[PDB]
Amino acid sequence: LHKEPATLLMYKGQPMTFRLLLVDTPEFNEKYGPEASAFEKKMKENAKKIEVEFDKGQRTDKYGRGLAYIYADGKMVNEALVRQGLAKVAYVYKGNNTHEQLLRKAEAQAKKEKLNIWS
Fold first, then answer.
1. Known binding positions for Ca(2+)
2. How far apart, in whole angstroms, are the C-alpha atoms of residue 42 and residue 39?
3. Where is the active site?
4. What's the distance, CA 10 to chain centroid?
5. Structural domain span for residue 49
6. I want to staple 72 with a disulfide (CB 3.0 to 4.6 A). Which of 37, 47, 92, 93 is the partner?
7. Separation in Å, CA 2 to CA 5, 28, 29, 52, 70
């Protein structure tokens, strides 16, 4: 796996929608929805540099969205949302799952700390 540059996303010169692989933030109309969006936006904007990392499976979902691990100055958005209790670890049968245990760990930390979603 490898990281690629992106800018505020602009990927290889085009804007695409990106989805956060292996994590399920609540939607805008759900509890913690707004706080999840706001955590994520701030982390992206304040970042000096943004990077996208594809997994070894499909690169796009059925909606056309990039399935990726997104990194702000070397910190994984996906994981930090999850650690904040602001996303749950998503289900995956197989394939696009390389950071699963890393992310499970964060969730555990968040759950035992009773943060946001777990409360």
1. 24-25
2. 6
3. 19, 27, 65
4. 17
5. 1-119
6. 47
7. 10, 31, 34, 9, 11
